[PDB]
Design a protein around this ligand. Sequence first.
Ligand SMILES: Nc1ncnc2c1ncn2[C@@H]1O[C@H](COP(=O)(O)OP(=O)(O)OP(O)(O)=S)[C@@H](O)[C@H]1O
Ligand SMILES: [Mg+2]
Length: 336
Amino acid sequence: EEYLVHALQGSVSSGQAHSLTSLAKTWAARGSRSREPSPKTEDNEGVLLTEKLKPVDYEYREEVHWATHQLRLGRGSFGEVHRMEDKQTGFQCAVKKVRLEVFRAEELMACAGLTSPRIVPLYGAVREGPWVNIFMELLEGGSLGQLVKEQGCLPEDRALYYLGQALEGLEYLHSRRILHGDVKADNVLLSSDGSHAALCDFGHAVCLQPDGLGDYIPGTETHMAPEVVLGRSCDAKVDVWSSCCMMLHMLNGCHPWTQFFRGPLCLKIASEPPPVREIPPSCAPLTAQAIQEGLRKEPIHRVSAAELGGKVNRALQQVGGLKSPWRGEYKEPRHP
Ligand SMILES: Nc1ncnc2c1ncn2[C@@H]1O[C@H](COP(=O)(O)OP(=O)(O)OP(O)(O)=S)[C@@H](O)[C@H]1O
Ligand SMILES: [Mg+2]
């Protein structure tokens, strides 16, 4: 690895996941470093995983070999995301811009090389000094979070449908010993037609060591599982808890806890019963039952992503499949 990395450094190369991953480890180390003076030559290095993004003489600089266009797609706690165009190939994709000082190699490790349709393909990453750029398929339907905001709430059938696809994605991750670390609506991306969903945002991902146990800071407070808050050992079940919080979010048009408690929520999530009281009463028995098994406080008793995927698939059948329209009528969220 050490020899490989040395070769990659200073250059933007076409290559494969492991190369990107190995280089990304060096980036995390440099982000921790003390403030230094800017040199005259700003380091430009990375690797791209598709020939639709082409370096030129081992360089890939914004406003030279590529550019952003139009308004921002979105911004989370760590990165701004834009549409982009490669000036050589004309290819369009998304860029997530992250400062080196907050970057984590795991964000790439957790999705470079993967090939689930429920996970955004990673196209590569290059850095211009402290500016990290992460390239990935552009999805024109926005985030599930944006949809929930627009529509107010989602119908039970849309909610079940998307939760199911998320769990397909989590099962793929979990079987590869990857924890997503921040499952929520804002980190699920949609097609133009709203038919396909894919997980994004591996900024809080951790690579579960062969043990299958974890380092792990959670991404979003409202979606934290009790075992996390209690500071105990964490596994993939953490994600299924999160997915059920996202489920509640879609149904009620608001995160769990929020309407009832003022932060911090660590105390509450640990102290209180799981927020199954926030399951709408109008929900079908199989929906309520899935959400309840996913919000078991003891992770050992909590269902796996695969197990829950089954339950929610059947619950969708019970409500009579995906009938509701895409971008339908507004639904008033639960009020406090
Ligand atoms: N590939 C993409 N295509 C379209 N929109 C995207 C894409 N990636 C991200 N977005 C949007 O940009 C937002 C922020 O991107 P994220 O990757 O979630 O960044 P982030 O939330 O800062 O990451 P964390 O907090 O470090 S896990 C998402 O909520 C989406 O709305
Ligand atoms: Mg995000």
